């Protein structure tokens, strides 16, 4: 592939160029007054989002070198998403500032690697700042401050969060889906559930249910596929005689089994009802454990050393009350030992710290949910698809901060935090001229968010920015009354996890940007 | 794929031009003086219609930014449709309306998102007067005048829609086809009918009529495929001594059963027939226990417990007189116990209200509707294929209109309903100016559609819209007789379903549309 | 797809230059000096053909607007062919003055849809008065005289359907094929024959003839597939013994049976020949059921409960007289009881009147001819394939007129029917102004036919026009002898289905599309 090449200032402007059009687009929405952009997928109706990790993601320019500095940016938006769902355009707005100043002082013929050692010796300053300047929030109060100011200024969903929020507990995990009713609603479910259903409709007990409820139930959580009644029997004849109902978990089952019981339940000799183990594979046999230690019973299993058959009542577990559905299995509250139990969910906790795979954490996370905290579906409401994806985006972001805010602390919102934490560190002096003008190019910097969300409610940027500098503490201006105010007051709040993350974020990138010397890349 | 980018007016202008071109069109159709649409279908000859949601859909521009502005529009046409069959060209012409005037604000410089939290207001507020406003319809002279209104003033398709609204009653579905006869005919059937036909010709006992007639029939209703008379027989020979005829449903018949029947039959030994059961799968389950829950009879079957052989003679179910063609089946009036099928109804009305496919809801109205209420079809007529098209849709929405008439009532006709919410609601302010300004786009935007009834019918509708909104009540222009009166003694009514569903679909695009500042979409 | 959307009187005038241009093709061909057009066939030679609905199917035009309006109206056309061979021209005529007319009147600002609704209205008039100057046809001479109008006036044609017309009967079809011989020959095959021939040529019994001739056979009707001789025997020794000879008629048959065959028939023991079953299926299972029923005989079956082998000599049919040949087989004159017969005719003709599928209607019609009417096939001859075709068609229109006019009557042709119920219906008056204006489009439309079989002549058509309708009865201008004069006297008679379903087509597609007022289409 024939290479065209550009040396010098040639190529850094093109870069930043390319940047110029990837932070143009993803600024506009930045602030509450920030509009939408409509990205447009060719393969159905045109997306409209305040989101800048999805904006950034969608543009690419056609002049190749342009495209190379466009490219690059997306890469700190995208950390920003993977690490917290918020941060994702205030990261955007704070490197495009870098990359400006930075690629100004490479002009001035300032070495380019001195002023990235300045810049990311204040940046290490800056987040130790902003830990101090942090303070812990888990009042409800706030959680609902927090996921507000996230959901560009929804009340209601600030509240909704916030409640789910208390009802799961620190394991619990809280979801969103589409829900079709135009207002949103929060279910919280209670205790292990599974999705799985009866086998048989003929099961059904309670037929205006719809469901089978079994009062006072023993539980078998079986190994392997089991369709010999044929070799079960005479475990089903000491329940039989002992006359609680069962539930049998198990993973492939016959008519063997289930005409059997329902010649056995229809005509109530027997009180009994069966559903397919969870998922599949090792997942699904771990999981097992944690149910056979919450119904203080146990996984009986020929591959851990059981004949099936063999197994005594006592050798089963034990639970108030279960109901299931075609859809879904709940369980309530189990015989087993509080202390086991609280040991299963540390012992998975260790899994939890040792996770490599995050998204496997968050299947442990659901396991923790479903042993000792709870699962909560916000069921988003919206007239349109247009307006339901919008409103879950908001929604989502709401949820990622909350979380941020609890781990780690809440600071001054609308900028006033990053304007803070620049004053504090002017003094800050690395150890030649060049690192000073870097650390420089990040205070300046870190102004930048507070002067566009002015710049997109309309006020003159400079004007409030000198303001706010000129206050104290988290004297700052509320966008959308268009007021001066003690920002945590006012309930403009944000985690101190995001705006660290952006500026941690925004550096790296940066700071590798304004050293580049010559760009390579395909012949038009 | 390199990304060319618009910001600003520029964006907003195409995005408009893009609207524009896909209201214009729809716009054409509103009124009863609307005109049709010959949209082209490569293969095949071009469609004449008048429904708005079928022009939506064919619209595209080749202008890549105009383009999103129309597919955006398309969806406030498709959800409406998705609520009820009526209402998708006003929501358009609605929503076109508040996209022009929300942008000339936006172009003011009033803030995007406050006008868009004003409109809301502004239609949550109205959706409420619409309801009180609502009077409600199930006069057979109300349905049919709904019907004719939905059916662009056609008489006889909204009198044969009521009597067949009459006739199935609530639970019943009604439904069209084409019928080649030029006039339209309606046919209800009557109590349980099955499309599925005897198995052999021989077992036809009324050859002029080409039917199987058996008076007085018992019926057993039968699991799995049954290709053994061989094991059948006790059952079949206490039948045979009995002498009431027997009719079998079944999954899969031999020549074994059906020359053996034929010998019997044929010969007068036995009396008999026999046919393939209904569709496939636990569908065809679930729907064999409704037909012995009516029949006093049994699902006898092997898989829920009984030897099919072991079947008594009061296992069977009973009915009063069966008919069977070579795609028919009709059941005439069960022995089943009243309460039980009522209670099976309502079982089956948990499931209906439980429904999370709509489709498969239908299904289940359709078994209500064998259970307790008719089947009624409308065989719409027209001499070419080009006028049975268009026919059937006006056929249709006159369909969608009654039903939806019934169940939230009626408002008056021709735009007056939303002329007359929108007055009592003027002083309705919003928390800040850009509020009140939304609120104001809303209210100007309802007096849209009666504007373009009467743009269509060629009266100036600026004096038109003035002289309904001096008048109050039903007071409205008549488009047709080109008078003004009021609308309920005229005939002129709107289901309220269809005049909300309007007003939130279209609010709810166009709100988020107004605030679009940056547009992304691919280089020409 | 990128989509050009035109509006009001651009996308009209488009619409009407597309019809013109099929119209103009097709009207060339209109009256009896009416010229061909040639058609051209890339795989093959040209097509010089007079039908219109040939040249209708043909043309597409490349302006994709224009195409929009021709396909529209080569439905008119295409439907016309549908209801009956004649009448795809005038049709086509018709349609083309109604919409030219329309458009001028919407041009107008005359409302679309009330033009639409009068033009209904007058044509539904002109049906009623069409019928009452209708007056049955019957005799041979007439029932030529339709045939050779319908024939591009070839007296030989209409003489040769007539009798052909005679010898079937009403229940007998006649069909028309190739004939290699220049000039025309009509067969009427008699009684019931399938198209199958003897199994082995050794059965000849009349070398000369090349054909099995069995005086006073009996003739078994077999149900299956019989290669057991094996089996069959002593049914077989029974008719040897008897000494009259034998038809099987069977599905699948080895030399088993004809070498066995052949061992008794060519030594002179028995007297015996063999043909295949017609067809396949089910469809071959009903006829021999008619075939049984005609010869007093059974279809005689395993699965309709006879072993075969147990057949006895009465259990058979009988009949004159059989001739097979290797393509042919002729059954002269059945022992069936004919009120038996005349009763399987008549459930038969329950059947037909019900029939669905009206090309299996007319296997039915086939069945019914062999019944108790006659199939009569007639051999189209010309010196070139080029004339065959041209001729065939001409032949084909004919038969299609003819059985037209039997059913329906006949009405003055050349026009004057369509000038005269336009004269008594002039006073028709609709609820408004503009449907006042739809009747006078749609009467002045009816005098266009005549108005073009004059200019096809090259007679001033006003001229003609005038003194036609000037004239009353069946006055009307003989266009091949351009003349004056009662025109049923002077032989033109136009069958009253083909005059009447050409009204009603071309209204239906013409009324809607005077009311397009948007046209949407892919871009070129
Ligand atoms: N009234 C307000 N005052 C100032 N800024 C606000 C106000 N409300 C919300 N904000 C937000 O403005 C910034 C939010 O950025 P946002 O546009 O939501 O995308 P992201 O969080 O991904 O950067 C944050 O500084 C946050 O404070
Ligand atoms: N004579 C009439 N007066 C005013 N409007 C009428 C009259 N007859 C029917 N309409 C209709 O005009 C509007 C019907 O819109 P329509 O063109 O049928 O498509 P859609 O119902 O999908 O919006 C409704 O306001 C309805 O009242
Ligand atoms: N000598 C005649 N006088 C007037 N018209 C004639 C004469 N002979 C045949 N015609 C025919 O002219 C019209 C025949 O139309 P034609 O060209 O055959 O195609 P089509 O029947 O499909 O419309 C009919 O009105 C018929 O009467
Ligand atoms: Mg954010
Ligand atoms: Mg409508
Ligand atoms: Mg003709």
């Given at each position: 592939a024939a290479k065209d090449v550009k040396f010098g200032n040639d190529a850094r402007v093109k870069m930043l160029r390319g940047v110029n059009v990837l932070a143009d687009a993803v600024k506009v929405t930045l602030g509450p007054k920030g509009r939408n952009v409509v990205l447009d997928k060719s393969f159905g109706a045109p997306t409209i989002t305040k989101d800048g990790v999805s904006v950034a993601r969608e543009i690419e320019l056609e002049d190749k070198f342009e495209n190379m500095g466009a490219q690059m940016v997306k890469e700190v938006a995208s950390k920003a998403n993977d690490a917290a769902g918020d941060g994702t355009t205030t990261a955007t707005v704070l490197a495009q500032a870098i990359i400006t100043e930075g690629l100004k002082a490479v002009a001035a013929g300032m070495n380019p690697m001195d002023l990235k050692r300045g810049i990311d010796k204040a940046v290490t300053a800056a987040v130790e700042e902003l830990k101090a300047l942090s303070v812990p929030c888990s009042d409800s109060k706030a959680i609902a401050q927090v996921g507000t100011i996230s959901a560009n200024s929804d009340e209601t969903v600030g509240k909704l969060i916030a409640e789910a929020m208390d009802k799961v507990g620190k394991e619990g995990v809280i979801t969103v889906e589409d829900g079709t009713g135009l207002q949103d609603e929060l279910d919280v479910v209670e205790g292990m559930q599974f999705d799985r259903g009866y086998l048989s409709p003929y099961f059904i007990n309670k037929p205006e249910t719809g469901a089978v409820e079994l009062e006072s139930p023993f539980i078998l959580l079986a190994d392997k596929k089991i369709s010999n009644i044929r070799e079960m029997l005479p475990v089903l004849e000491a329940v039989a005689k002992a006359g609680k109902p069962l539930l049998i978990i198990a993973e492939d089952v016959e008519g063997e089994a289930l005409a059997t019981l329902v010649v056995n339940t229809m005509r109530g000799i027997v009180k009994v009802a069966a559903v397919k183990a969870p998922g599949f594979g090792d997942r699904r046999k771990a999981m097992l454990q944690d149910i056979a230690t919450l119904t203080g019973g146990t996984v009986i299993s020929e591959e851990i050393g059981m004949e099936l058959e063999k197994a005594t009542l006592e050798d089963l577990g034990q639970a108030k009350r279960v109901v299931i559905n075609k859809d879904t299995t709940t369980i309530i509250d189990?015989?087993?030992?509080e202390a086991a139990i609280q040991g299963r969910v540390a012992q998975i906790r260790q899994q939890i710290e040792e996770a490599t795979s995050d998204y496997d954490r968050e299947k442990l996370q659901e396991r923790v949910a479903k042993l000792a905290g709870g699962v909560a579906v916000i069921k988003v409401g919206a007239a349109t698809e247009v307006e339901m994806k919008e409103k879950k985006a908001r929604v989502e972001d709401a949820l990622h901060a909350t979380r941020a805010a609890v781990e780690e602390g809440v600071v001054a919102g609308g900028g006033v935090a990053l304007i803070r934490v620049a004053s504090k560190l002017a003094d800050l002096r690395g150890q030649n001229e060049d690192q000073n003008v870097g650390i420089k190019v990040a205070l300046r910097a870190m102004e930048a968010p507070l002067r566009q969300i002015v710049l997109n409610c309309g006020e003159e940027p400079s004007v409030v920015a000198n303001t706010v500098k000129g206050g104290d503490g988290n004297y700052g201006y509320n966008a959308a009354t268009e007021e001066y105010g003690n920002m945590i007051d006012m309930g403009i709040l944000d985690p101190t996890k995001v705006t660290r993350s952006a500026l941690q974020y925004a550096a790296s990138v940066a700071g590798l940007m304004i050293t580049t010397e010559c760009m390579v890349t395909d012949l038009p």
């Open positions: 189990g015989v087993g030992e």
